[PDB]
Amino acid sequence: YPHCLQFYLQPPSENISLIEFENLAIDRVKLLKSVENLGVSYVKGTEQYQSKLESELRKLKFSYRENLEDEYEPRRRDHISHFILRLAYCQSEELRRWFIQQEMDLLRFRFSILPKDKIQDFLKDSQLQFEAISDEEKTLREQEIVASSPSLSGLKLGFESIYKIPFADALDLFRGRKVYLEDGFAYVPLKDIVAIILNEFRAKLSKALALTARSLPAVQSDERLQPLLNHLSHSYTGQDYSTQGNVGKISLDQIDLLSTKSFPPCMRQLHKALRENHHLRHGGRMQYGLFLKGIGLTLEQALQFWKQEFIKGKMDPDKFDKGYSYNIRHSFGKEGKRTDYTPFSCLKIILSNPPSQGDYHGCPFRHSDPELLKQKLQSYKISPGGISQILDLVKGTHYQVACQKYFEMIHNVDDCGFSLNHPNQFFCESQRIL
Amino acid sequence: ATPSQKYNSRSNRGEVVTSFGLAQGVSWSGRGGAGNISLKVLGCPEALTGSYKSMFQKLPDIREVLTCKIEELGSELKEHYKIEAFTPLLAPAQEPVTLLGQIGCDSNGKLNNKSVILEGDREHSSGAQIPVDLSELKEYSLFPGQVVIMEGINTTGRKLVATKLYEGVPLPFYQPTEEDADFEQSMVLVACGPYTTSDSITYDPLLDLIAVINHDRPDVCILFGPFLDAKHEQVENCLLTSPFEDIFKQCLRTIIEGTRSSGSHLVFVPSLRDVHHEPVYPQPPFSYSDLSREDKKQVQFVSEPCSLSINGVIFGLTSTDLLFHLGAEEISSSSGTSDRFSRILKHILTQRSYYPLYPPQEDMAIDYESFYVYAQLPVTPDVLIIPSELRYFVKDVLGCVCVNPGRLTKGQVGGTFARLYLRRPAADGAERQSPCIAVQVVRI
Amino acid sequence: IDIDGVFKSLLLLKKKKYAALVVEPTSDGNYVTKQELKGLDIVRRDWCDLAKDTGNFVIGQILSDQSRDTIVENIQKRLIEIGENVLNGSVPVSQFEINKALTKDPQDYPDKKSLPHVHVALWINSQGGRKVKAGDTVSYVICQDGSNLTASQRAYAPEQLQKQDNLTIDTQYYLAQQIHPVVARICEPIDGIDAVLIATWLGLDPTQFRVHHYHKDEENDALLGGPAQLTDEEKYRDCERFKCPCPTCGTENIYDNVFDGSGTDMEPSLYRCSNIDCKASPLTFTVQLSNKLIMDIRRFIKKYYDGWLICEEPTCRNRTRHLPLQFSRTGPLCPACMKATLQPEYSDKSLYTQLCFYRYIFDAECALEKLTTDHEKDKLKKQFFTPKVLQDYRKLKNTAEQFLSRSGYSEVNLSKLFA
Ligand code: SF4
Ligand SMILES: [Zn+2]
Ligand SMILES: [Zn+2]
């Protein structure tokens, strides 16, 4: 581990515990998902993006300038975590494309982190040769570089470093006659340098991921890594943390106002459907019941609420008892865990059991068409421009970010200060707004 | 007081009960550490040079261990018996054709003569199973986990009937050399735990063995485990005031200091019943740090089981009570016609493995990959040591002579230990020339 | 690519083992709801006729065209009347009978103590006349004798039971292993339904039934957005607690947490013995606490290496140790169920979990990183956490850490994964 950035082409050969193995896998999955969501929400170059992702790195300790702390733990964490993601992600072309997008975002940000003094030794450590030119050479060949340069306006050849490269390394660059050539050597600004290195890095990663895809069947024989490595990205929440066992004071009568002021669109419309129908299908019923369990409602409050609502449902109260009260108590109590003991996370809500005719569960952004999304947004009184970028985000299949933007719009705020993954987190933050 | 009061009032103190070999005098002694004494572990990639690695089992590679052992034994017996070709267990042929597979019990209890099944290797019979019938078979001797070559008639496919069985030829004896003939006569101490009574910590039998050794001056001494057994009531109730490793180190240092004057070589065989050590058969040796240079030159530790050579004579050491384990479910057509001990030793020599029984009894813990790569007999041993809770005995079968040293302590009742002369006889002449001379089983 | 068939409703259970309403599109867009399914077969004939009737009712209700909620409500109500009828004894006695054949003679079975039908054969051959020969079918029923024996050790004959008023039948044993498996085999895969929930539906079982209940099929990575890595209180909730009698007073001591109490008095359990009258701190007896730890982790290692195998078809649940040489796609085929897959009773990772649970019990250093309020951390550590007691706790840690270091791929090597 000689430098912070590193190109990942030498797999580690150390020995680590299972707990550290899972910690690295989950931490790097969280980092890449955060990179995806932040890059979707913001522009890739803004200081807000830079500082927010720096804070994400600091809370996940994945990169920093060399010191006593950096040498042992963080860069090694980066190494093994990246390779276990290689194993997780080499399954499919779609996952490979996703991983490549996020790792290019990560590597470009990290390169922007590195100060200009250390980029020379980084390229030297990169094992592929590139020679920076001297100031005298730059001054002598400035006119040639400007004359042969791309549409960059003016003669200004600023502080940006210029390197010497074999011509075969920049084929697509020079083949447009937008660079000067000297004895088979090119001279290039920093933006095109990083473009070249990222293209080469994507080529090497594509080949390596294909090779690991050829190596998956042998390495999947293990039983303690199959159920994880099948689903690091597909169906794992990034520490949603809205686990059962929370506390709070909720008044049963206030449920309507709390639904219209603090519920994510899916749960809001589910509660309205319950109020207007006094009956739900299995999926929506279980979803809303365990959500109400999560928000802090106690067992007696939940039972009384559901019984009262089925009073308007017109079935026998003893039938209610025998049929459902067992199910609600089981959800609040004993095992059957991870399906009835837990509050549903957003990634689960979107990927599991899409609603059908007569169903109202499921995230509406992913499970209903844009015209009905627009109708619902009009019914919820959001500005037409806000609805416009909501639909733009829906076209970009970033449903969680769309829900985020809906949250700031309904709360009349700018940034929620997080990235939502759990409806109970949505509700907790809305209560934090008071 | 009343702890070990039998050992303070044992009439048979020093008396010898049984003997094998030649009528020999009683002044049993050795030349001390002086003289050329060889001591080398042998066979099956060197019986855990390192400590050990794992407790993670994979059912697939356990299966490949099983089928590999079955295939190896099948190939060896096919080449030795000039067999035409084996047949799949599910392929019915009317003419008597040979089969192959390891013996198992149909249910989960103790083996019964009519509750036995046959399951073969996958390359012959897809690893399937089939019940066997022994009513037609005249003589046999079966126990779970042994390879057999049953040329039974299977005209139906769903059940075979035994016609005649093939005994398994044992491994050839380890071929000696001239330097082996260049050894003079030597005698060995053997002793197995427990070294204290059921209600003591004093280790009076241990002191008695120290006295016996420093009075007799033997060549090499053998001490089997357990040293601090878990089944002891004083430890199972766990009233001890000192750590298990502390007590164990105290014990080892007591034996070491008690045999400084002996000069005889020393080695300890760990046992599954030992509490502080890893309960995984086969086991790594013990762990100890405080040794001087002469201590290292005089004391060793070996894995359990171990195949070690002394003066070019093969010693096969196993601590587990394999005799008792086999005797529980081994079956034969006749019981009183031959010796149960004789047939059990027949099986242990035949199956080429230090533990031929599968599945083992509850009070063991076998990791099968390590068992296959570390617990195979390299050769038919010259002499075997099997400390067993059953009665002490010494027999010789198929050239291999076996001594049961007995238990040094049976609760509070008197125990036994054994002495054996070994000496390489004339290099040629008779085809079989056992290094052993004579053995005494002498009560402690 | 092409279409091969239509199923109006399908119960996905296993490869070539499912229930599915076959739909053959007829003329004018109509279809016939043909009834076909794979894998419903049963291997052992030792079920009550009322149990078979209940299973047929379950399959009929799960194969009706109506909605999931309607089917669930019908099955739950019917299961409730079945449970109440069995509990109050209104069910006629003849339906409780169990039939079973005899492969061998009664004494020949090595598991005579565990097989109730061979036990009944022993009883009849002893007390009566005509012996039970191999190839004959024994008829018997379970009974409750008040002798706290195992159910298998209490099976009687129907006529003998009807002639005996002293001892009665065991509704608990039926609701445990004669009705619950038959229904649960089909009704369990339906989402939002678990064997614990059926137990609550049918009777007073839940607690003792989770005690005597298999939690192997419950695990499945089909959670499409559920767990990430869990927390301790649900990781170790299946791990057995730590036992130790107090040398001073002979009182049992319970430990499943580094600390003990609620809030201000959240002192470690080792500070005070569970006995209120005991005045000696367990902190003195670190030697024999470590000895007990060595002993019971030794017992757990022995239990795992025992290599006990269980058939995962809930009806069979064959308990055996001989790993069969036959081996299917998923694992070792059941020698009794020619279509099944075995797996250990005590998982290797289950033992890993329990040993990590022990190191969690004794890892005061990590437990000091979970209470957020640093002021409380400081006052508690100054009032009780001396360096001597921390060294004792660290010794307790190492007592299990020196097994965990060599423990069964609790560490993973990267070379064979990246080769
Ligand atoms: S993103 Fe999650 S919380 Fe928001 S509406 Fe969709 S499922 Fe609900
Ligand atoms: Zn006490
Ligand atoms: Zn089965």
Side-chain angles (χ1 to χ4, degrees), chain C residues 43 311-313 316-318 334 336-337 340 342:
Chain C
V43 57
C311 177
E312 294 294 328
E313 158 162 60
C316 170
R317 286 294 174 173
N318 187 10
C334 165
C337 289
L342 266 47

Side-chain angles (χ1 to χ4, degrees), chain A residues 11-19 21-23 26 80 83-84 87 215 219 222 224-228 230-231 234-240 243-244 279-282 285-286 319 321-324 326-327 330 333-341 344-349 351-353, chain C residues 67-69 72-73 76-77 80 84 190-198 200-203 205-210 213 215 218-231 233-238 348-349 352 356 359 404 408-419:
Chain A
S13 296
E14 309 162 352
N15 301 332
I16 62 176
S17 57
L18 205 71
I19 45 163
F21 195 85
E22 60 85 19
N23 273 332
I26 284 302
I80 296 89
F83 270 94
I84 188 62
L87 294 174
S215 176
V219 308
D222 167 273
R224 69 199 190 271
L225 289 187
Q226 174 211 4
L228 282 72
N230 270 14
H231 311 299
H234 186 273
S235 76
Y236 269 19
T237 67
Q239 204 262 338
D240 53 320
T243 316
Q244 219 273 333
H279 167 51
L280 279 82
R281 304 278 189 79
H282 170 219
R285 168 174 72 256
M286 182 179 72
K319 181 257 183 183
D321 309 332
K322 270 76 175 179
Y324 293 10
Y326 281 1
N327 209 340
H330 181 279
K334 222 176 286 203
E335 283 179 317
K337 292 189 292 185
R338 291 193 297 274
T339 52
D340 304 334
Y341 200 67
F344 275 2
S345 61
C346 292
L347 177 60
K348 191 179 193 306
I349 293 165
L351 292 181
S352 65
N353 310 317
Chain C
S67 78
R68 181 262 169 204
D69 271 343
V72 168
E73 293 177 350
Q76 186 173 355
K77 293 179 179 179
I80 290 189
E84 309 296 4
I190 295 89
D191 303 356
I193 292 301
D194 189 359
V196 174
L197 186 52
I198 296 89
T200 52
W201 285 26
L202 61 83
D205 298 336
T207 45
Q208 51 275 37
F209 194 83
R210 84 171 187 267
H213 171 54
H215 313 270
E218 301 174 354
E219 69 195 20
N220 186 9
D221 63 358
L223 303 172
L224 310 163
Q229 278 306 353
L230 294 174
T231 62
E233 293 177 350
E234 295 85 357
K235 274 195 287 185
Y236 315 137
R237 181 177 181 170
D238 285 330
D348 54 81
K349 300 291 105 175
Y352 166 73
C356 292
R359 69 172 309 285
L404 189 62
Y409 283 110
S410 160
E411 51 79 23
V412 55
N413 173 19
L414 278 299
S415 313
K416 65 178 72 66
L417 275 296
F418 298 151

Side-chain angles (χ1 to χ4, degrees), chain A residues 11-272:
Chain A
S13 296
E14 309 162 352
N15 301 332
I16 62 176
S17 57
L18 205 71
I19 45 163
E20 158 186 7
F21 195 85
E22 60 85 19
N23 273 332
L24 274 296
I26 284 302
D27 275 329
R28 197 65 178 276
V29 167
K30 280 165 46 75
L31 174 69
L32 278 177
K33 286 187 141 294
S34 307
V35 170
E36 164 176 330
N37 263 334
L38 292 199
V40 167
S41 78
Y42 296 162
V43 60
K44 281 75 190 167
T46 179
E47 54 87 19
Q48 180 181 183
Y49 193 50
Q50 300 149 12
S51 52
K52 188 177 290 293
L53 183 62
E54 282 143 31
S55 309
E56 186 72 25
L57 286 173
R58 302 315 152 192
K59 70 163 259 193
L60 284 186
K61 53 194 71 61
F62 270 107
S63 288
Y64 173 53
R65 174 66 181 269
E66 292 193 347
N67 60 356
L68 179 54
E69 194 270 332
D70 181 22
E71 285 177 350
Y72 277 14
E73 275 313 280
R75 198 174 297 165
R76 168 192 209 269
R77 283 154 40 82
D78 190 355
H79 188 196
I80 296 89
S81 60
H82 169 89
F83 270 94
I84 188 62
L85 294 175
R86 268 197 191 176
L87 294 174
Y89 290 157
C90 64
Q91 316 213 22
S92 85
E93 165 69 28
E94 155 58 50
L95 294 174
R96 270 164 280 182
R97 207 191 72 258
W98 182 72
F99 181 30
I100 288 305
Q101 295 173 357
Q102 282 101 41
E103 55 80 19
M104 294 296 172
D105 291 331
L106 183 63
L107 184 46
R108 194 220 299 280
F109 175 56
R110 292 180 181 177
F111 204 110
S112 61
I113 298 174
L114 183 63
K116 183 263 212 172
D117 55 350
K118 314 309 285 193
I119 62 170
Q120 285 69 229
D121 54 70
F122 169 64
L123 274 296
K124 266 65 181 177
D125 294 329
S126 310
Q127 188 274 331
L128 73 164
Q129 53 153 290
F130 295 102
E131 284 201 10
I133 73 179
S134 52
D135 285 296
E136 51 93 12
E137 287 172 352
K138 178 254 189 181
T139 48
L140 179 67
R141 208 161 298 282
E142 181 174 1
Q143 67 166 311
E144 281 76 58
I145 289 165
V146 169
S148 304
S149 283
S151 60
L152 200 156
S153 177
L155 178 140
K156 290 277 195 171
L157 199 64
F159 298 152
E160 58 270 13
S161 194
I162 307 299
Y163 272 62
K164 183 176 68 66
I165 297 89
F167 61 92
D169 186 74
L171 298 176
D172 213 317
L173 188 153
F174 82 84
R175 77 175 173 88
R177 203 180 300 124
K178 44 204 183 304
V179 70
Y180 182 80
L181 272 297
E182 169 207 313
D183 292 330
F185 290 99
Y187 302 104
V188 58
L190 186 52
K191 195 292 181 193
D192 291 331
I193 297 169
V194 306
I196 286 157
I197 73 172
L198 62 83
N199 299 131
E200 181 146 340
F201 185 76
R202 88 165 305 281
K204 310 282 279 312
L205 272 294
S206 196
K207 289 193 289 295
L209 285 158
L211 282 186
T212 56
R214 312 240 180 171
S215 176
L216 172 43
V219 308
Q220 54 81 31
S221 59
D222 167 273
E223 279 323 284
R224 69 199 190 271
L225 289 187
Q226 174 211 4
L228 282 72
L229 271 296
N230 270 14
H231 311 299
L232 276 296
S233 52
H234 186 273
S235 76
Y236 269 19
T237 67
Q239 204 262 338
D240 53 320
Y241 182 76
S242 296
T243 316
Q244 219 273 333
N246 189 359
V247 74
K249 302 296 184 292
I250 308 314
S251 166
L252 198 72
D253 50 19
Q254 287 164 355
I255 190 166
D256 298 345
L257 61 90
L258 289 171
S259 76
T260 178
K261 78 199 274 300
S262 298
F263 281 20
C266 48
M267 192 85 58
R268 194 192 204 288
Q269 61 91 16
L270 197 61
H271 161 275
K272 275 191 283 169

Side-chain angles (χ1 to χ4, degrees), chain B residues 51-60 62-63 66-67 70 102-115 117 119-122 125-129 230 235-245 271-280 358-367, chain C residues 103-105 107-113 115 244-245 247 287-292 294-295 297-299 301-306 308-309 318-328 330-333 335 338 342-344 348-349 351-352 355 395 399 402-411 416:
Chain B
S51 173
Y52 193 76
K53 182 55 209 66
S54 69
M55 72 165 148
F56 182 76
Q57 296 301 284
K58 297 182 179 68
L59 279 76
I62 295 174
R63 193 176 98 266
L66 262 69
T67 189
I70 307 307
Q102 84 173 2
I103 290 299
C105 173
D106 189 358
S107 88
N108 216 347
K110 64 203 81 53
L111 191 173
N112 303 337
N113 67 348
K114 64 180 73 66
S115 178
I117 66 189
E119 69 275 16
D121 62 358
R122 181 177 65 83
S125 306
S126 302
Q129 302 193 349
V235 302
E236 181 281 337
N237 286 7
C238 69
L239 287 70
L240 295 174
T241 70
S242 296
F244 286 174
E245 65 278 18
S271 179
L272 274 297
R273 314 170 51 121
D274 184 90
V275 63
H276 82 91
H277 205 269
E278 299 294 329
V280 192
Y358 171 81
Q361 191 194 344
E362 282 57 27
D363 44 359
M364 283 74 74
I366 299 177
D367 164 80
Chain C
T103 74
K104 311 176 288 188
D105 307 334
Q107 76 282 8
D108 297 331
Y109 284 55
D111 283 323
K112 61 176 295 297
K113 90 174 160 163
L115 277 296
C244 167
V287 171
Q288 65 264 37
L289 271 295
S290 173
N291 297 140
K292 198 44 174 79
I294 291 294
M295 272 305 307
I297 70 182
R298 184 176 176 87
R299 180 186 63 256
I301 294 169
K302 290 183 181 179
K303 168 208 276 180
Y304 161 48
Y305 296 142
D306 290 339
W308 284 105
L309 277 297
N318 187 10
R319 170 168 174 71
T320 184
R321 175 174 46 174
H322 170 71
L323 161 69
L325 277 296
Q326 186 38 258
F327 204 99
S328 89
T330 62
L333 179 54
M338 301 305 218
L342 266 47
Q343 63 199 42
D348 54 81
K349 300 291 105 175
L351 187 153
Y352 166 73
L355 190 153
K395 180 174 73 174
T399 312
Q402 63 84 30
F403 273 18
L404 189 62
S405 62
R406 81 182 76 259
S407 71
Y409 283 110
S410 160
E411 51 79 23
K416 65 178 72 66

Side-chain angles (χ1 to χ4, degrees), chain B residues 350-371:
Chain B
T350 299
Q351 287 303 323
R352 320 198 190 281
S353 66
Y354 273 111
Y355 203 107
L357 165 79
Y358 171 81
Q361 191 194 344
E362 282 57 27
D363 44 359
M364 283 74 74
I366 299 177
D367 164 80
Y368 276 53
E369 61 86 20
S370 305
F371 155 78

Side-chain angles (χ1 to χ4, degrees), chain B residues 23 44 107 165 251 315 353 409 416 427:
Chain B
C44 204
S107 88
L165 187 152
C251 287
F315 266 102
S353 66
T409 300
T416 61

